[PDB]
A paper describes a structure:
The envelope-anchored glycoproteins, Gn and Gc, are produced by enzymatic cleavage of the glycoprotein precursor (GPC) protein encoded in the M segment and are jointly responsible for orchestrating host cell entry and fusion. Using antigen-specific B cell sorting, we isolated monoclonal antibodies (mAbs) exhibiting neutralizing and non-neutralizing activity, termed mAb HTN-Gn1 and mAb nnHTN-Gn2, respectively.
First, this fitting rationalizes the approximate 50% occupancy of Fab HTN-Gn1 within the HTN VLP reconstruction, where Fab binding occludes the epitope of the adjacent Gn molecule in a neighboring spike. Second, the fitting is in good agreement with the previously proposed organization of hantaviral envelope, where the N-terminal ectodomain of the Gn contacts and likely stabilizes the prefusion conformation of Gc at the membrane-distal region of the (Gn-Gc)4 spike. The refinement of the Fab-bound reconstruction was focused on the rightmost Fab, resulting in complete density for this Fab fragment. Only partial density is visible for the other three Fab fragments, as these represent a superposition of symmetry-mismatched Fab fragments bound to one of two possible sites on the glycoprotein lattice.
Author numbering:
A (entry chain A): 21 to 264, 271 to 285, 289 to 371
B (entry chain H): 3 to 222
C (entry chain L): 2 to 216
Write the structure that this text describes.
Amino acid sequence: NVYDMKIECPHTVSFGENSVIGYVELPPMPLADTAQMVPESSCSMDNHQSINTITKYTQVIWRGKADPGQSSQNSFETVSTEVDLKGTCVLKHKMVEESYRSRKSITCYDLSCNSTFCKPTLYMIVPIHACNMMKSCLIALGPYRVQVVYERTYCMTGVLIEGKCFVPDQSVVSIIKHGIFDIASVHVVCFFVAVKGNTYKLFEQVKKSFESTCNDTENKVQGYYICIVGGNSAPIYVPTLDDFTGIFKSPHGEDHDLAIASYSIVGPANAKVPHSASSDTLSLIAYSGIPSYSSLSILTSSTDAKHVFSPGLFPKLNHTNCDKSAIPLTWTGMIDLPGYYE
Amino acid sequence: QSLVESGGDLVKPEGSLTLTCTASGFSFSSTHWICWVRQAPGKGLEWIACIYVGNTYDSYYANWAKGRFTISKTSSTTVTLQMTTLTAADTATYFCARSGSVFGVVSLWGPGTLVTVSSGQPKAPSVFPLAPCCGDTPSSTVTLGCLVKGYLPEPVTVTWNSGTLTNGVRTFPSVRQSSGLYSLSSVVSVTSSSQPVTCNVAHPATNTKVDKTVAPSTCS
Amino acid sequence: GQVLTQTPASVSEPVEGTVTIKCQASQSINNWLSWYQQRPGQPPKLLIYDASTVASGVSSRFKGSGSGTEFTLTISDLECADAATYACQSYGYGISITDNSAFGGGTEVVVRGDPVAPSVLIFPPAADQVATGTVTIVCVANKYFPDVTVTWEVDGTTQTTGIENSKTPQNSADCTYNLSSTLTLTSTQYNSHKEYTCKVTQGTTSVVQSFNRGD
Ligand SMILES: *[C@@H]1O[C@H](CO)[C@@H](O[C@@H]2O[C@H](CO)[C@@H](O[C@@H]3O[C@H](CO[C@H]4O[C@H](CO)[C@@H](O)[C@H](O[C@H]5O[C@H](CO)[C@@H](O)[C@H](O)[C@@H]5O)[C@@H]4O)[C@@H](O)[C@H](O[C@H]4O[C@H](CO)[C@@H](O)[C@H](O)[C@@H]4O[C@H]4O[C@H](CO)[C@@H](O)[C@H](O)[C@@H]4O)[C@@H]3O)[C@H](O)[C@H]2NC(C)=O)[C@H](O)[C@H]1NC(C)=O
């Protein structure tokens, strides 16, 4: 019962240091079987060794209160523990470009989990250098098998959108010189990379884009998120910088409402994401039903990246009040981008 | 708040039996987990299976009980547990469990039900009176009792004077004999001036209720 | 394969003393353990959960400590009502839902109190019993501590076959036992011998209660 991961390739290969990405959503699997699950790829490009490394996660779970009498009042509690997760989409600084120059692929997965079962979404980032040979590949992830299928679009360097090619150009200067351009909705997949520094003051710019009261930005997370718009000229370091907002208009990602609906809201909750904090630092909403959306997030109000794994809980991703903060690790959706095409 | 376990009769080997667990005066809600736990006499607790008992369905079975057992939720107050191809090793006391998570902390238990897997046929008790030898010199206080002989299966209940009298009552646990039959004895001590005392032996399995009355003046 | 080891199998500690129960897990559980009290013929009661938290309504004399792969349970200021069976449950969360989910072997707690001599009573078989063909004799020992051994003798010869003993659990007030000994024979055998003796031995002390058939 193999599943397919389609990849689109333009006619012209290697105009630049560009990479393509594909994804596939897998059927639910037991949560216990996702431990130590790593992709085993059969492509001609060896997977990056840093993806299979151990990344320490905080597991936040919800359960009915253990104390009798209070358990009779159907209240629920939160438990925070440290776990080790491998193969998750935790990229490092300049990993995409180094993988491009090293002919190495980046195969990671995003997991959508309720309290007991997980829906994994496998991602693969490969350079366009594999778009000329177009050698078929097989990827094994736990009990599932994925066939890497390459499709050759009728575009020189653009991305196929509604039967037409589209090229997004970089910075305002190129648009001004071209003197005319067109904007269309282009699918995009993004990953958050956390890196400490002095030029990575993320939230001082976050407050600038949208009116959010976020004081004491120095103690908050520092980093950028790199997104792939597919095709050629995909890599973007940070969006809306004016050299190359939509993600935060729909922070939850592509519309994935459960819609027959056996989903039951249990109620909101608070929990300690560092598991050693004096008080709760993150708010979540526990739920029951089919797993939906992303169960992984990162606490912003901590310079060091505090990765969050909350099976059966929905992390609070609204930064309107900056309280109980979290941000999605991965985001898939459609954004309108300027550009031009033949 | 309580859990009640029903079923649990005598079953022939290689047979099947379905147990049922009921909740009293408490809706099932959606943040609870119902589970079944068994314990053989002289052995520790054993996990069997669990049910989320909510809107969504997901269940987990024990490794030994996988495929052979069947657990499912029926209504907003009842859950069941189908048992198949039961052997002699399955003879145990089966408890109904309620937890806040899967295989988690049991916040509330039930009295439990006994499943006896034996090839023998059910039998009614043969209550006999226990009195001192008539040669004994009369005393200020005398002890009398009723003896419940071979019966199958358990549980049997013995009460004195319809539960009105409790002081001085010593009921002993049952013991299995060579023929696979159980015997229980219970004695009571009363003064010679007291009115005659009645023991009420009830066997729900055979639906037998023997009322044997004894008096302080009674002798063997 | 996750295995749960609970030690010791049986423990005997006096009143006002302390009891130590060791529960060791083969696999790490990260301070996820629960301690239960199980009286005979009763549903188990939860007293300690998360290996350190006292359940509401449980006395402070119950203390749970430990983390990782080794845990201990201590009962201070031991009482007679505390004599019961205790077990530990290893429960997991999230990834560890089915990896480490097992129950302890179970420990038996006997509370030593002030020794009391057994008052021995013997009951000859009823008239209705001999007619059936199977005859049994009941001998009981009441309000005694510690445990005793029961000996049956017919005309001076000790019996060996057809003897059953049922012992009451310790009383929740004075930590005392009650034992019932049944000697089952056949009516043909019972009509042959005359001297029937029930002997209860409590260490050096022996209480002998006998009767003669037809008297
Ligand atoms: C965390 O997530 C995981 C996974 O995301 C959850 O696990 C899953 O939970 C869902 C429930 O949301 C389970 O689906 C249910 O499965 C029931 C059993 O299905 C099987 O048995 C029946 C009978 O033998 C077969 O017919 C089924 O075949 C069907 O599916 C296949 C495809 O797989 C089709 O090809 C077939 O044609 C069938 O359609 C399976 O073999 C199933 O009975 C149940 O269906 C009820 O509910 C749905 C949704 O409401 C209704 O559409 C359907 O009609 C049934 O409705 C009942 O109630 C109504 C109202 O009274 C009645 O009118 C109906 O007659 C019927 O009685 C549902 O499909 C899924 O099986 C399970 N995963 C696994 C692996 O088991 C976790 O629960 C979740 N955890 C938490 C805490 O939320």
